[PDB]
Each structure stands twice: as structure tokens, then as C-alpha cells.
């Protein structure tokens, strides 16, 4: 724990091994961290006393890939690590798993609660975006996943013809009726339903970072430079169009948003170039402006609760803070070395 | 009245309807062009399938090598058999954490290899579906080739 103003460092030693995933609920001043060992007890501590409020224990055996507190603070979603891949909602005050669902195969890169709706939880993987509805009756909760159709790498939408039941082509009246394409060799089972052409394996948009609007929509960044809307209720997708003002002779036409955090006037994005950009977004279009330049590429970025302090973390571990309306704007809290101390 | 016939002696062939050996030979030439075109398209697709087989075998090779790398740091008691290659106090805790971690990379690489094998075999299911559609087409193409050549030989 590093204080910004006084530059003091306090160590909370995990007595059982290296700390795994990290999350904080600021309105409750609680810090929930997983321990990277056999029993992934989510240690929820309270700050500044560093007092162990609770240990959350599940059926998991390594860690949780992500921990995410709700905006209300009464719930903590955990997307578990290997090997379960269980998304579990925790009433961490009571240490009770309200619901859980195992999804082996898809690896969640980012998850986030909807701040205005604790029942909506977005999980973004490198291939899919899923919106999860926590459907409750009395004391039972269940997870209803809703995978969202993503556009192709050019931003177009693929019309999925029913592979098992193709529509009626004109029957060539000598050469047999037109069958489903996996018939004439016939792999019996789920392979015929997961059957797709490898010549028609069209790649989809890679979702990198999703952030929530005040209107329960989702800003999603792509490695192809695209910015996507996903409504948390209707799951509609419409690719944003860049307002390209004719400024010639510059190679900044491709920007890959590593992270995206919402601001009251748009989205703060960060690229691999070390540039933080301002995306001023109007209905179905966006304009990119240069907001900040950093010597090293930006890995993570977040806002303060009062939205006046801006934490920007680079790939090497360097931490910068952009204070809005104060000179100097950028202050380096941590100067990062290689970290791998050999001698 | 009457429909276009070609047998009755009262019927006389229209002079444009008069079918000659040049017409029959041109028709057989067009049919042969269609046959060669369809066969060339399917053989091009099959060559693409063969190169796709080479590519998926190479990807399975890379995944099997990564599987051996992650199994090197894996304890023996939680081992999962390698998919076959296609032919053309604190210390114990995180030690066993590493064990089950490499167990799930093992399961993920096995499931990914299974997905690639299933999708390649399903690609073969596609092109075999396009095979017997066109096999039934080219066999009748040879049949109507014989019909036209009998019409060529007689006329």
C-alpha cells in the first residue's frame, strides 16, 4: 500500500505465499486479494487497519483470475482460475456463494459489474463478450449467460445460415437431395453441430477492454481499432465510425485501445504507442484527440472515486498519476526497474 | 396444334432444327469443357484441403510440444495422455498449485487439439459432401458424353 501524498509504503504479508488477484471496494475501504496456492481464500481486509475482515472459501483450488466488487459493495463476483473456470457471486459479508456457473474453455480477460445494476456482470474474453444476468428467487440465485454476437474483423455482421438445417436450394433432381454439408462423411455427435467450414472460419473482433456507460451500455475496444457498443439489456452491436478530419501525413490512423475508462465527456483510451487518447463520442461516431504522452506503453488505467485523480500504470510497473486541474499534471509515484534482481 | 416431334413422316424437320455432326461435335466440346471445369474446381478444393491438413498437423505439433513443456513441470500423478500426432508447508502448497495449473493447461491444449482435429475432419465432411454431389454429376456427364458420341457416330 503506497500513499500518494506521503509516499509511505506498508506491507501486508501473505503468510502462505505470493498474492494472486487483487481487487478493492473503495466505498467500504476493503481490499480483497486471492492467495496463489492450494486454497484460494479470498482475504478481504479492511484499510487502514489492515484487519482481516473475512476469508472467502470455495471449491476452487488455485486462485481466481479476476475479482470484481459491486458498486454497492454488498457483492463480490469472482471469476475463478484454473481448473474450474467458475464464475461465482459472493455475499462476502456473509461469505455465501449466491450463484455459480462453470464455463470451461473461455478465458475472461476483464470482468465488470454494471455500476447501476448489480445483477448485470460483463465478462470479456479474447473471442467473446458475455453479459450475465443474476436471476434470483427467494434465496436461490442463478447465472444466465448471454453471449453477444461480435462483428467480423472488417466490422461487418455475419448472417449465420442454419448449418444443421440449410434452406431449400433448388433440388438437382438427379444427384440426390441437398443435404447438410456434414452428412456425406457423417461424424455422429456434437461434432456435426459444432461443424463449421474451415474455408469459412471468418475471424471476429477481438474485445480488449469494456467499460460501462451511465446508460447501461458497454464501450468495448478492439485490437483492430474498432470501438463497439453493447447494450446490457438488448445486446445490440453497432461499430463506431471514426470522424476522420483530413489531416494528412501522419501514421496515427490505427489506434489499439489497451484500456478504456469512461469520463463525463467521452472515453479515455490508451495505446501501445504510450499515448492516452480522448475519444469524444457522439451518437454513432467518435473523434480522437491527443490527451497525454508517456515514455512507456500503458498497461492499466483507472479513475479516482471523485474523478480528479487518474492512475496510469505502464507495462514495466511505472505508476503515474494525472491530477485534473493541477500543475504539474503528471507525477511519477513508482520508478520501475527490470525487477528481476540477479545479484 | 401439335408439339415438336422428331419421328413422324408427316412431320418435316425445320432447317434450323436439322441436327448435323458439326452441331453434335460442338455440343460434346462444350460438355467436355464443363466436365473439365467442374473436375478442376473440385481438385483445387481438395488441394486446399490437403494443405489445410498440413497446416493443422503443424499446429497440433506445436500444441503437443507446448504440452510436453507444461508436463515437464507437472507431477506424474495428475497426468493426462498426450493426443496422438496425425500423419499425412508453503512449498507443498504452491508446488501442487503448479501441478494443477499445468493440469488445466494440459486440459486446454488437449481440448484445443480435439477442436482442431474435429474441425479438420468436418472440413473433410464438407468436401466429401461436395464430392458425391459432383461424382454423381460427372458420372452422368460421362453417360451423356456416351449418348452424344453415339449421336456423333450415327449422325
Amino acid at each position: 500500500f503506497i500513499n500518494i501524498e506521503t509516499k509511505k509504503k506498508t506491507v501486508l504479508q501473505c503468510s502462505n505465499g505470493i498474492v494472486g488477484v487483487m481487487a478493492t471496494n473503495i466505498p467500504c475501504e476493503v481490499v480483497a486479494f486471492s492467495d496463489r496456492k492450494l486454497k484460494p481464500l479470498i482475504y478481504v481486509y479492511s484499510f487502514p487497519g489492515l484487519t482481516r475482515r473475512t476469508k472467502l472459501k470455495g471449491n476452487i483450488l488455485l486462485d481466481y483470475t479476476l475479482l470484481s466488487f459491486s458498486y454497492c459493495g454488498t457483492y463480490l463476483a469472482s471469476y475463478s482460475s484454473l481448473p474450474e473456470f467458475e464464475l461465482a457471486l459472493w455475499n462476502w459479508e456473509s461469505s455465501i456463494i449466491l450463484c455459480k456457473k462453470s464455463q470451461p474453455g473461455m478465458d475472461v480477460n476483464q470482468m465488470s459489474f454494471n455500476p447501476m445494476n448489480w445483477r448485470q456482470l460483463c465478462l470479456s474474453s479474447p473471442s467473446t463478450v458475455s453479459v450475465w444476468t443474476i436471476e434470483r428467487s427467494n434465496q436461490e440465485h442463478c447465472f444466465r449467460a448471454r453471449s453477444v454476437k461480435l462483428p467480423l474483423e472488417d466490422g461487418s455482421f455475419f448472417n449465420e445460415t442454419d448449418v444443421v438445417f440449410p434452406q431449400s436450394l433448388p433440388k438437382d433432381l438427379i444427384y440426390g437431395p441437398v443435404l447438410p454439408l456434414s452428412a456425406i462423411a457423417g461424424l455422429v455427435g456434437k461434432e456435426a453441430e459444432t461443424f463449421r467450414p474451415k474455408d469459412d472460419l471468418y475471424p471476429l473482433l477481438h474485445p480488449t477492454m469494456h467499460c460501462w456507460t451511465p446508460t447501461s451500455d458497454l464501450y468495448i475496444g478492439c485490437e483492430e481499432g474498432h470501438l463497439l457498443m453493447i447494450n446490457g439489456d438488448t445486446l445490440q452491436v453497432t461499430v463506431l465510425n471514426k470522424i476522420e478530419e483530413e489531416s494528412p501525413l501522419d501514421r496515427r490512423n490505427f489506434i489499439s485501445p489497451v484500456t478504456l475508462v469512461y469520463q463525463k465527456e467521452g472515453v479515455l483510451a490508451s495505446g501501445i504507442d504510450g499515448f492516452v487518447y480522448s475519444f469524444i463520442i457522439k451518437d454513432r461516431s467518435y473523434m480522437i484527440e491527443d490527451f497525454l504522452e508517456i515514455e512507456r506503453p500503458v498497461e492499466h488505467m483507472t479513475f479516482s472515486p471523485n474523478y480528479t485523480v487518474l492512475l496510469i500504470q505502464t507495462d514495466k510497473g511505472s505508476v503515474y498519476i494525472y491530477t485534473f486541474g493541477k500543475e504539474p499534471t503528471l507525477n511519477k509515484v513508482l520508478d520501475a526497474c527490470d525487477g528481476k534482481f540477479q545479484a | 396444334g401439335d408439339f415438336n416431334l422428331k419421328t413422324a413422316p408427316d412431320y418435316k424437320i425445320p432447317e434450323h432444327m436439322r441436327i448435323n455432326a458439326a452441331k453434335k461435335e460442338e455440343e460434346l466440346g462444350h460438355l467436355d469443357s464443363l466436365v473439365h471445369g467442374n473436375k478442376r474446381h473440385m481438385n483445387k478444393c481438395i488441394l486446399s484441403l490437403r494443405d489445410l491438413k498440413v497446416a493443422v498437423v503443424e499446429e497440433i505439433q506445436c500444441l503437443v510440444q507446448e504440452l510436453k513443456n507444461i508436463q515437464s513441470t507437472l507431477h506424474i500423478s495428475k497426468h493426462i495422455p498426450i493426443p496422438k500426432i496425425p500423419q499425412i508447508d508453503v512449498e507443498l502448497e504452491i508446488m501442487k498449485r503448479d501441478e494443477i495449473k499445468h493440469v488445466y493447461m494440459q486440459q486446454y491444449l488437449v481440448n484445443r487439439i480435439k477442436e482442431l482435429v474435429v474441425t479438420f475432419d468436418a472440413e473433410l465432411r464438407l468436401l466429401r459432401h461436395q464430392k458425391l454431389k459432383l461424382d454423381t454429376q460427372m458420372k452422368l456427364s460421362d453417360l451423356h458424353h456416351v449418348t452424344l458420341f453415339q449421336e456423333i457416330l450415327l449422325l
Binding site: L187 | E26, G29, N43, I46, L49, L127, K131
Partner: peptide, 29 residues
């Protein structure tokens, strides 16, 4: 006179296979 010989792609899990046509040059017609 051979344009492309018969090549047979086999499946991995299953015994399903596909054989290409023995392509020859088209006739003088």
C-alpha cells in the same frame, strides 16, 4: 496426358477420406 493425379485426404479421428479426380487434358472437341 495427366493434369492432376488422384490424391486422397484422410481424416484423423475417422476413416472418412476423399479422392480427387484423375484430371486429364480435355479432348480435341
Amino acid at each position: 496426358p495427366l493434369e492432376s493425379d488422384t490424391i486422397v485426404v484422410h481424416a484423423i479421428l475417422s476413416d472418412h477420406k476423399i479422392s480427387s479426380y484423375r484430371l486429364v487434358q480435355p479432348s480435341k472437341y
